[PDB]
Amino acid sequence: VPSEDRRKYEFRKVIEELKDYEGSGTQLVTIYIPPDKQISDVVAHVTQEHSEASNIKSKQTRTNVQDALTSIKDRLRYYDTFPPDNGMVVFSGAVDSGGGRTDMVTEVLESPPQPIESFRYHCDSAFLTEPLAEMLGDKGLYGLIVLDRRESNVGWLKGKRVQPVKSAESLVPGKQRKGGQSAQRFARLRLEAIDNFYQEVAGMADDLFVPKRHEIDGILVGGPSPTKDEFLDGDYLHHELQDKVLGKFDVSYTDESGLSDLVDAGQAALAEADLMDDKSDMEEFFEELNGGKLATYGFEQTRRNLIMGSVDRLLVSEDLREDVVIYECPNDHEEYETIDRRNTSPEHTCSDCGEEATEVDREDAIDHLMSIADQRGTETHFISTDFEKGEQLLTAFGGYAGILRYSTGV
Ligand SMILES: [Zn+2]
């Protein structure tokens, strides 16, 4: 299971490929399989559909549908009892190529950034990738703390889903009678329990957040009134977690559903936290550009530095949509051209000789560069286009850049 940013990029790419496909009728099959849905169960479901497909009126459709389902069965023989992490999505169907000819497409997308929730069987004129294109929305692990005077909830924001894990109660004497010329406050007793309260909440945050150590990207704290302020301002929460707190937010509901409200109210603070590694990468890149050394950009120059193993970090735009087309000249120079994915490979005149170059391969430009980076153990970061320098990586520098450790040549 590769990096999450890398998984997001792979999925968007394949999704675009799958949507380019179309059958002559209703014969493209899509199956979403949650990680807890057993394989023999879905294998059993397709057998049912394969048998039911005998009822299909037109022969051509019947043959195509049954071939697609048969191909699914065959593919699932290479999987164990359960689909991999986060589930699995299967696509299968006889697609329309040219001249009335068909081609069997069978593909499986394993382990989305966000786990598959529900099992779904779909048969259509197009592959069902829309529900998959929505679980590519968020990234990051964030701790959540909501507390009141009565209760407290601690949990996770894993991407876009909220997960309550720990909970607590007041531990102070109860509410009851107001006024009556009486005030049986337990002055010192209450403040001890309140200190003990907030300390156990820190404990909860310690039992939970220290596991995913640096893995968490921030912590949200919610609560109404000075209750949250009192909790945050007074050093109860332990400084080690006070560090990664993104901010305090006004949330007046403190049950398990308050965690979702916290995520809602802190949406702006979250989107900025998401950009932490990106903004630090690009700030470092621009300082090296202005510094005149240790920086590279553009597909050609980035590729060259990658080969030399001189690249500290490969920086590629996550919104990149280019293919690299690989060429061979009769005199043995491997040229390269980048174009948009949906564009036919361009005619290439080969500088160094002027002869017409011959296309011998084509692949995703990032996949191409990233394989080299992996050989040299170079970290590859996918830069969001949301912020200014991240957008400029794409629009000003072509979407390809690299921070060097040793600058040389050129
Ligand atoms: Zn040439």
What would you note in describing this structure?
The protein is an alpha+beta fold. It is built from twelve helices and 16 strands. Strands 7-6-5-8-9 form a five-stranded mixed beta sheet, with helices on both faces. Strands 3-2-1-4 form a four-stranded antiparallel beta sheet, sandwiched between helices. It has a four-stranded mixed beta sheet with strand order 10-16-11-15, sandwiched between helices. The longest helix has 23 residues, at 187-209. The radius of gyration is 28 Å and the shape is flat. The two termini are 37 Å apart. The site of zinc ion has 7 residues, from loops. Keywords: Cytoplasm, Protein biosynthesis.
Summarize the structure.
The protein is α+β, with helices and mostly antiparallel strands. It has helices at 4-19, 39-52, 59-75, 187-209, 225-233, 239-242, 258-265, 267-274, 276-290, 299-307, 365-375, 388-395; strands at residues 28-33, 88-96, 102-110, 120-124, 141-147, 151-158, 161-169, 216-223, 245-250, 295-297, 311-317, 322-328, 336-340, 358-364, 379-383, 400-404. The chain folds into two domains: 1-139 and 266-410, no CATH class; 140-265, 2-Layer Sandwich (Nucleotidyltransferase, domain 5), CATH 3.30.420.60.
- Rg, Å, rounded: 28 Å
Number of domains: 2
Regarding quaternary structure, what we see is monomer
* H/E element order: HEHHEEEEEEHEHHEHHHEHEEEEHEHE
In this entry the ligands are:
zinc ion
Helices and strands: which structural class? alpha+beta
Instruction: Estimate the global geometry from the Cα principal axes.
Output: flat
* Topology, number of strands: 16
Counting DSSP H or I runs of 4 or more residues, the number of helices is: 12
What fraction, in percent, of the residue positions are helical? 25-40%
Distance between the termini: 37 Å
Which strand order spans the largest sheet, edge to edge or round the barrel? 7-6-5-8-9
Strand content is 25-35%
Major sheet description: 5 strands, mixed
